[PDB]
Design a protein around this ligand. Structure first.
Ligand code: CMX
Ligand code: CMX
Ligand code: OAA
Ligand code: OAA
Lengths: 426, 420, 145
């Protein structure tokens, strides 16, 4: 079946493709040859940019699947490593595959020591996302063979190096901002445990990994591992489409994730909640959000795709309660405020008409703060988890038969042709 | 004026927008609401991603304009700083505006000294593009904070050449040379890259003029992959310095800016004219992986106007430097002739692009192949920040977030490890 | 306010800083021969032992300059162990002269450190006041005037 597009008297048929799930799409790859026009879609929200087998999202139903598996099931049952294997390879690992996979990860968690010098280029008050962006970008220098696509196995190795090294770079970035000695990765700890250790171990006593926090971290990483064609993943695919070194591409993804409209929102959400401070102050805040020319937004609400509850936000809220309970905390003022803010927003026509609901960043900072993670590290934690999705998406993009460079068009609305004018006559 | 799209037994009208120049476009922003589908365009080649007043390209005619001015006129007459002012602001500067602009740039060419430590994080054999990407990304840490947009733009344009030169010096084990306020953009870059601690550096005017032209020729090129990456990362509200590192990452790819380094290696591997046939056969051997680097373009389906200027400039500079013959240039020109008369390339409308002749000129200026793409990045930083600024200042700017066609596994339940 | 008998207003209006330094340290205004010897000694001690550069790196870039001055001058005591316990009078003069000559260099480097600017060395052709301005404000991009 086809679709018909008619413009300026002329008509042409476009192929209609259907996926396993989700909306059908109209293939416009021959549109200019057929009708002499381009589509116009700033924001790309109505353009399917690629084929993918990694993640599926039904925005209207609030469904999220990774290689077919619902996010709730993975967050409840799986280890972060199983989900990393799944996103990267396509299937859950059997015991032998799992052991081989985790052995490969532990074999690449250590960083080349010269990298220490890079951290010294930063002021101690540097935002960790900047340290993460710059240092991952710098890491591309150590893997020059990756400036090349060529061999399949080499792409797997680049992906594994990035997934294994990002937690170490992130932890060292944190330690650097605190003036604390860098803590090395430990082979006897799993991905979640090891990150907590590298982040909080001190030189004066042995670190005791709290299983309550290890299980929370495991969940947090799974909930942020991948989310289809979001801005940062799209940046990774765009940069990677030129054949660029994957390490540099991940730095590009980190840059995009840092924006407050994307991953940076989790840091923004806790600051917003702290400023509201008390439930009595919610009305004043909601008024600013609803104020047409104020630009203030309800951080943690809204999504390009979800037009319903974000399944990750539901699990995130549930996890806040479970973790606080296990840590023996009877009350969390900020969690109480956030829940009340959600209810107020959800019963207000401004938000209902716009289909605005809590997204993954609304409840994440509350859990992270309870885990002892500082606000300055919320987006970096997101980046550590998301690196898995970024490299999985990059790998799929670059290995896909028929892969081409990503290079869009524009609608030129500038000055018409004019001749150069010498400086004296301007 | 509207266009009609019909699918499933349902039609809907879409607005048709017209630009100052170029093809009309069909506004599909309401397509999902109207018809329940998305368009499918991997590669984005048939999708206009934004409005822009910066640069216009007519690919079929081989036309390139910056704020309406033809690239040949700017390359012939303008100083690079005038072109930077033009791309950032929209008009050529008068004398007062120009003097104020160049003053601001010179006021920001110096780097925070702690930056020196970043370079030490690299092995001396690190590719300069890696040093550039990481170091510019790192710079975002030093600038955590409209006139602020202008200042960010000016800081990036003023600092990237210093970072680029220091990266080069680092790879050579040479002392870092500081920017000089008495030198213009092109002269200063040559000084920072080549001055030695054992004698005063004398800028060769022939090289300065060549550098000035090369910077102009690489300043901006509409929605190419790197600029698109900068715009996408920037659409989230991300720090512009980090967005430029993103652009540097994309530019490094051999299908993009990295092609200029790849061209000289290709030409060197061919060695002589008698070896062109074997190479062309590989390029036509569909499955070889081999491409004629420096040929082809997503938009141009005719000669790249920058390539014609690049070739003239190769000839002009070699003559001015007293070089009677350049075997490499002779080889490139013959390769161009052979490819252009072969049906494989004719049918696909493949022509030389900006990267085909640039390395040759750069090599003649004493710039090492390891620095070709970095020079591209230094010049393009102007386009990147101009595009970023236009994007972020535009009324109604939204995050860039595309869709996809899911073709993976249907929903299935998780099975525990013990049962796998 | 009198310094060795001289009213502050007269010194501020007519004396060079170096003349006042000599006055406070020795007791009398210097004649020309004494003035030349004194200032030659100061210029001969304005440069710091390069190992000192590392001390600045112990501070965060946002450190208050007084903290940098306090610690670095304290550290400077390590480079002059013979001063730990002085008996000879000529040695007290040399310690005094080294402190007067080096404090401006330490102060300017502290300032440059907080600004992320390259350290500027003292210049023998500049007097005490001019040299302090140069060390604090000269940039690597153009000659300082
Ligand atoms: C997430 C998102 C960037 C999606 O952007 P986008 O798909 O372009 O939304 P949109 O521009 O089509 O908005 C539609 C309407 O809802 C409004 N809106 C969107 N999000 C809003 C919010 N959080 N608060 C108030 N109003 C909002 C828009 O103003 C618009 O209203 P009008 O048509 O009257 O102008 C946006 O909802 C937002 O900025 N949310 C707050 C930031 C945030 O939480 N980001 C994290 C998202 C998840 C992640 O990436 O981690
Ligand atoms: C520049 C570009 C990446 C454009 O990519 P894209 O718009 O997707 O071209 P395309 O995929 O539609 O190619 C159309 C046909 O020409 C072929 N082709 C394209 N460029 C080719 C080249 N340089 N050599 C041989 N064949 C080429 C493609 O294989 C395709 O052939 P088939 O239909 O038989 O499969 C591509 O031409 C290329 O890789 N060129 C060589 C690399 C290069 O010089 N890059 C620099 C470009 C300028 C810059 O960014 O600096
Ligand atoms: O999907 C998006 O657009 C943003 C998002 O929620 C994520 O990346 O987790
Ligand atoms: O325009 C493009 O797609 C690539 C290009 O020539 C440039 O970025 O200079």
């Amino acid at each position: 079946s086809t679709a018909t597009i008619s413009v300026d008297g002329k008509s042409a048929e476009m192929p209609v493709l259907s996926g396993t799930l989700g909306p059908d799409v109209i293939d416009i790859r021959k549109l200019p040859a057929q009708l002499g026009v381009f589509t116009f879609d700033p924001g790309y929200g109505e353009t399917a940019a690629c084929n993918s087998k990694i993640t599926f999202i039904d925005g209207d139903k609030g469904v999220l699947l990774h290689r077919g598996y619902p996010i709730a099931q993975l967050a409840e049952n799986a280890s972060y490593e199983e989900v990393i294997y799944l996103l990267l390879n396509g299937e859950l690992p059997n015991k032998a595959q799992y052991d081989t996979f985790t052995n490969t990860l532990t074999n690449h968690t250590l960083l080349h020591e010269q990298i220490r010098n890079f951290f010294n280029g930063f002021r101690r008050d540097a935002h960790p996302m900047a340290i993460l962006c710059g240092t991952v970008g710098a890491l591309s220098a150590f893997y020059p063979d990756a400036n090349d696509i060529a061999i399949p196995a080499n792409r797997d190795l680049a992906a594994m190096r990035l997934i294994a090294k990002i937690p170490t770079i992130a932890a060292w970035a944190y330690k650097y901002t605190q003036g604390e000695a860098f803590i090395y990765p430990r082979n006897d700890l799993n991905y979640a445990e090891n990150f907590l250790s590298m982040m909080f171990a001190r030189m004066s006593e042995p670190y005791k990994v709290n299983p309550v926090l290890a299980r929370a971290m495991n969940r947090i990483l799974i909930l942020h591992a991948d989310h289809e064609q979001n801005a940062s993943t799209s940046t990774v695919r765009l940069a990677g489409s030129t054949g660029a070194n994957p390490f540099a591409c991940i730095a590009a993804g980190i840059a995009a994730l840092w924006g407050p409209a994307h991953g940076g929102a989790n840091e923004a959400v806790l600051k917003m909640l702290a400023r509201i401070g008390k439930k009595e102050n919610i009305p004043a805040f909601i008024a600013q959000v609803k104020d047409k020319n104020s630009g203030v937004k309800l951080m943690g609400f809204g999504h390009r795709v979800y037009k319903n509850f974000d399944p990750r936000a539901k699990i995130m809220q549930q996890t806040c309660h479970e973790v606080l309970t296990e840590l023996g905390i009877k009350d969390d003022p900020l969690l109480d405020l956030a829940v009340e803010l959600e209810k107020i927003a959800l019963s207000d026509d401004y938000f209902v008409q716009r289909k605005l609901y809590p997204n993954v960043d609304f409840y994440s900072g509350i859990i992270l703060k309870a885990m002892g993670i500082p606000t300055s590290m919320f987006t970096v934690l997101f980046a550590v988890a998301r690196t898995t999705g970024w490299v999985s998406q990059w790998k799929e993009m670059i290995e896909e038969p028929g892969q081409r460079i990503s290079r869009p068009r524009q609608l030129y609305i500038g000055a018409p042709q004019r001749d150069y004018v010498p400086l004296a006559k301007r």
